[PDB]
Design a protein around this ligand. Sequence first.
Ligand SMILES: *[C@@H]1O[C@H](CO)[C@@H](O)[C@H](O)[C@H]1NC(C)=O
Ligand SMILES: *[C@@H]1O[C@H](CO)[C@@H](O)[C@H](O)[C@H]1NC(C)=O
Ligand SMILES: *[C@H]1O[C@H](CO)[C@@H](O)[C@H](O)[C@H]1NC(C)=O
Lengths: 188, 184
Amino acid sequence: HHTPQPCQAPQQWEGRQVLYQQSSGHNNRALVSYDGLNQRVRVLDERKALIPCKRLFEYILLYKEGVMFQIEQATKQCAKIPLVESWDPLDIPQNSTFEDQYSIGGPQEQILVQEWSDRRTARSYETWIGVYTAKDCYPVQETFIRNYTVVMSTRFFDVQLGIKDPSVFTPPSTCQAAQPEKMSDGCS
Amino acid sequence: PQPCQAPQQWEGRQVLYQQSSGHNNRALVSYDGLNQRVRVLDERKALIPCKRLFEYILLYKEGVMFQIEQATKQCAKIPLVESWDPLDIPQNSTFEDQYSIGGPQEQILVQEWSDRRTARSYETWIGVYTAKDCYPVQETFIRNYTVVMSTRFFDVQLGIKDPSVFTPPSTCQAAQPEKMSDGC
Ligand SMILES: *[C@@H]1O[C@H](CO)[C@@H](O)[C@H](O)[C@H]1NC(C)=O
Ligand SMILES: *[C@@H]1O[C@H](CO)[C@@H](O)[C@H](O)[C@H]1NC(C)=O
Ligand SMILES: *[C@H]1O[C@H](CO)[C@@H](O)[C@H](O)[C@H]1NC(C)=O
């Protein structure tokens, strides 16, 4: 009945994430470091299971200087990928549409979250949906829609405030050399 | 870390996502695992293209599902081939992970359980439930490493407020045996 205003989402944190992509129907787990103050992000592929072997990479997205580095985890072999997209923080735009509010879990173990979108009233057209906790405004889930169809969804877990170690945003020595082509998911 | 016991009767709300369509479908849901029956009521955040809204009453002990159009109460009777699978963690699940959603003043712990057999390369089901009380959060079905569908649960209230919700309306005598189409 009453419509909240967007809380401010914390702009430096580390935790874990599961990124789902429509086009493959796959989930990818990863450690994540998010520094919205310096507009940089680091993502380290994680495995729960060894079941199909995949190569594992670490990504360092430095938006100020328009590059993302992909880095093979064991070998430290690199790839300099032009990152040309504009910075877009993980937060709730002041003009977001309040969609809904609900609880996850159940009585005695629960948390209220709020769902926010960019859908204009009386339009049915969404490109972005973001779910954040109601008190601390921690990020819970983020979804990108194209033609009424989900393109990717990310869930966030184990969010801790601050950056334990800013050097994670420093690419290894091998990345000046860095090639230009993006390496492949599989050992196969 | 040990499989908890999901409650066998509750009501709340869900979002079902399907890979084939890339769509989300929102519903109110009453889950009655004692009587092996579910009631799903399509709900709407917005008016998009025009989709008809249905209510489904799934009665597994009887082998049938009733599809009921919400305004007109027009009704189909469709047999239920799928046998009953409760929304719980089998006592033989593989523990996958544990993590928190939220932060200091507002945090819950959830556990992720699965189907996977380590060293035999298969997994068809992943379930997320809260650690202490075993409330259901998310359920995902998998085929060859690829998500088929996933449902998220919210606003879970214990119990069934009114068991009549599983009693279909009179019209469901008129056993139109074809499922009603999604379009207007
Ligand atoms: C402002 O908010 C609206 C959501 O109603 C969104 O559509 C629009 O893109 C936002 N403006 C920008 C992107 O600066
Ligand atoms: C967008 O959605 C509509 C309706 O579902 C579909 O007919 C259309 O083909 C889609 N767009 C594209 C580019 O295919
Ligand atoms: C473990 O036990 C069940 C039977 O209760 C068996 O059918 C199941 O497939 C096993 N776990 C899985 C799903 O791999």
